[PDB]
Amino acid sequence: MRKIGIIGGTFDPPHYGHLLIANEVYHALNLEEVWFLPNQIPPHKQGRDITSVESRLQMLELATEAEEHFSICLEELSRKGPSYTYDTMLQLTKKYPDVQFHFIIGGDMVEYLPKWYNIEALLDLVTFVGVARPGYKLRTPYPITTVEIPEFAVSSSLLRERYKEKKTCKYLLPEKVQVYIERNGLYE
Amino acid sequence: RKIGIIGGTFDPPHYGHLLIANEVYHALNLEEVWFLPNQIPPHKQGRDITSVESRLQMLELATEAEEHFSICLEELSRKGPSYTYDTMLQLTKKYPDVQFHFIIGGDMVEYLPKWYNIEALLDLVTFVGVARPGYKLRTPYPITTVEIPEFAVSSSLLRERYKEKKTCKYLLPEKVQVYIERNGLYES
Ligand SMILES: Nc1ncnc2c1ncn2[C@@H]1O[C@H](COP(=O)(O)OP(=O)(O)OC[C@H]2O[C@@H]([n+]3cccc(C(=O)O)c3)[C@H](O)[C@@H]2O)[C@@H](O)[C@H]1O
Ligand SMILES: Nc1ncnc2c1ncn2[C@@H]1O[C@H](COP(=O)(O)OP(=O)(O)OC[C@H]2O[C@@H]([n+]3cccc(C(=O)O)c3)[C@H](O)[C@@H]2O)[C@@H](O)[C@H]1O
Ligand SMILES: [Mg+2]
Ligand SMILES: [Mg+2]
C-alpha cells in the first residue's frame, strides 16, 4: 500500500488547519490514506505543560471520525520520552516496508526543520510535504514536496487563548471538538 | 443599534464569508449581521455570473442555521447594477435607529478608490476591514479594522475546483455543497 500521508502533531486542540492540510495533501498526491500521528511529548516543546494524552486523543478521534480516509497512528503514544520523528519513522518504515510515507508539515515546521533531530537522515527516510501557512513561508533549502492549499491562519495556541479569553471559535475547528472542550472546560 | 452588513455576490458563499461575519459581530459586539446579495455586482458587469435566485438559494443554505445572521433583500428589487452608496442611503433613511458597519475583505479594501461615491459612502457608513491573505489592509481611507484568522478561500477557486472535480471539503457549508453538486453548478 504505497502512498501514505502522515501528519505529526500535538493536536492541542486539533482544528480545521489540520484537517484541511490532511485532506488537501490526500487529494493532491493521490494518497491511499492519511495517518494522524499524535506525539507523547513534543520533541521541540519538551518543557511546557500541554493537556493529557487522553484528552488530546479524544479530541483527535472526534476531529477525524467522520473521515474514512483518516486514521490515528499511536506509535509515539506507545513509547516513553520525547517523540523524535526520526525514531518513529524508523519504526514505521520497518513495520510497513511497502509504504512510501509522506510526512505533512505546515510552514512553521518547514522553517524549524534544520533543528529537528536527525534531520538529514530523516529526509532520506521520508518524503516531506510542506504546506503554506500565513506568516510562514515555504522557502527551504531542503528538497521537499510542496502543495498549494487555501491558507487558513488558525492555530492551536490561538484556540487555547480564545477559550481562556471566552472568545468565539466558531468555524475554527469541528463542532464535535468544540463540544468536548466546553464540556470539560479545557483551556480556561 | 450596531448592525453588520456584508455585501457580496456570494457565487458561491463560503466559510470565509461566514467567518468574517462572525468575527466582526463578536469583535464589535454587533446586534446581528445582514448578508446583502447584489442584483448585479457594480464591478463585475457581465462577467459570467450565477443567477440571482440561485445565489440567493445558496446564501440561504449558507446562513439558515445562524440565529445572528439574516439576509437583506434591499438590492434585489429594481434596476441592474447594485451601487452600495444608493443601498446604504436607502437603509440609513429607512432605519435611522441603526449604526451600520459595512464589512469588506482586504481585496475590497484595496478597490475602495473605485467604488461609486466612495467619499460620500465613508461619511454614511462605518467600514470594517478584515485581512485576506494576499491583500493586507493598507488604505489611506479611515476604516475600522478587525484582526482575524485569515482564510484564503475564494469563490472563484471553488468555481474552478468544482469545474475540475477537485475537493472542496472544509471550504464551504455542506448544504451549499449539496446544492452545487446536485444542480451541476460551475461545471464547464
Ligand atoms: N493553520 C495551519 N496551516 C498549515 N499547517 C498547520 C496549521 N496549523 C498547524 N499546522 C501544521 O500541522 C502540524 C501539526 O501542528 P501541531 O499540532 O501544533 O504540531 P507541532 O507541535 O508543531 O508538531 C509537529 C510535528 O513535528 C514533529 N517535530 C517537531 C519538531 C522537532 C521534531 C524532531 O523529531 O526533532 C519533530 C512533532 O513531533 C510533530 O510530529 C504541524 O506540522 C503544523 O505546522
Ligand atoms: N476569504 C476571505 N477573507 C476575507 N474576506 C473575504 C473572503 N472571501 C470573501 N471575502 C469578502 O466578503 C465580501 C463578499 O464577497 P464577494 O461575494 O466576492 O463580494 P464582491 O463581489 O467582492 O462584493 C463585495 C461588496 O462590495 C460591493 N461593491 C463592490 C465594488 C464596487 C461597489 C460600488 O458601490 O461601486 C460595491 C458589492 O456590491 C458587494 O456588496 C467581500 O467584501 C470580500 O472582500
Ligand atoms: Mg506547529
Ligand atoms: Mg471578493
**What is the CATH number for B16?**
3.40.50.620
Contact status, residue B171 vs residue B151, Cβ threshold 8 Å: no
Residue of A136, A168, A171, A178 to mutate, testing the B interface (most B Cβ within 10 Å of its Cβ)? A171
Asked if B157 contacts B132 with a C-beta cutoff of 8 angstroms, the reply is no
Q: List b or e across A106-126, with b for residues whose CB sees 16 or more CB atoms inside 10 angstroms.
A: bbebbbebeebeeeeebbebb
Show the domain range for A3.
Answer: 1-188
- Within 10 angstroms of residue A152's Cβ, the number of other Cβ atoms is 29
CB contact under 8 A, B22 and A170: yes
Cβ partners under 8 Å of residue B45, min gap 6:
B81
Contact A68, A41 (CB under 8 A): no
Q: How many domains does chain A have?
A: 1
Contact status, residue A58 vs residue A180, Cβ threshold 8 Å: yes
**Cα–Cα distance for residue pair A4/A142, rounded to 1 Å:** 21
Distance (Å) of CA B11 to CA A5, B1, B38, B41: 33, 30, 11, 11
- Neighboring chain B residues of A172 at a CB cutoff of 8 Å: 149
Cell of B188: 464547464
DSSP code of B81?
B
The answer to whether B23 contacts A168, with C-beta atoms less than 8 Å apart, is yes
Is the shortest distance between the CB of B105 and ligand 2 below 6 Å?
A: yes
Q: Measuring CA to CA, which residue among B183, B186, B116, B113 is closest to residue B154?
A: B186
Contact call for residues A81 and A43 (beta carbons, < 8 A): no
Atom of ligand 1 nearest to the CA of A109: 44
**DSSP-assigned letter for residue B22:** H
* Nearest alpha-carbon partner for A21 in A180, A96, A162, A128: A128
What's the rounded Cα separation, in Å, for the pair A50 and A11?
10
CA-based nearest distance B161→chain A, Å: 12
Query: Distances from the Cα of B14 to the Cαs of A22, A59, A85, in angstroms?
Result: 20, 25, 36
- What is the b/e burial string over B62-100, where b = at least 16 CB atoms within 10 angstroms of the residue's CB? bbeebeebebbebbeeeeeebbbbbbbbebeeeeeeeeb
**Residue the block writes with cell 429607512:** B94
Which atom of ligand 1 is least distant from the CA of A16? 1
* Distance of residue B155 Cα from the nearest chain A Cα, in angstroms: 11
Helix pair B52-63, B15-27: axis angle to 10 deg: 50
**What end-to-end distance do the CA atoms of chain A give, in Å?**
43
Name the nearest CA neighbour of B171 among B15, B8, B64.
B15
* The one-letter amino acid at A83: S
| Residue A16, ligand 1, Cβ within 6 A | no
- What is the bridge-based pairing of β-strands B144-146 and B69-71? unpaired
User: Ligand 4 (ion): which residues have CB within 5 A?
Assistant: B 107
Q: Do A171 and B26 touch (CB under 8 A)?
A: no
Q: Which residues pair with B33 in a beta bridge?
A: B4, B69
Q: Distance between CA atoms of B40 and B110, rounded to whole angstroms?
A: 20
Residue type, B173: P
Burial A55-85 (b: 16+ CB within 10 A, else e): bbeebbebbbeebeebebbebbbebeebbbb
Contact (CB, 8 A) for B43 and B178:
no
Sign for the pseudo-dihedral over CA of A110, B168, A159, B32? positive
Resolution stated for this PDB structure, in Å:
2.2
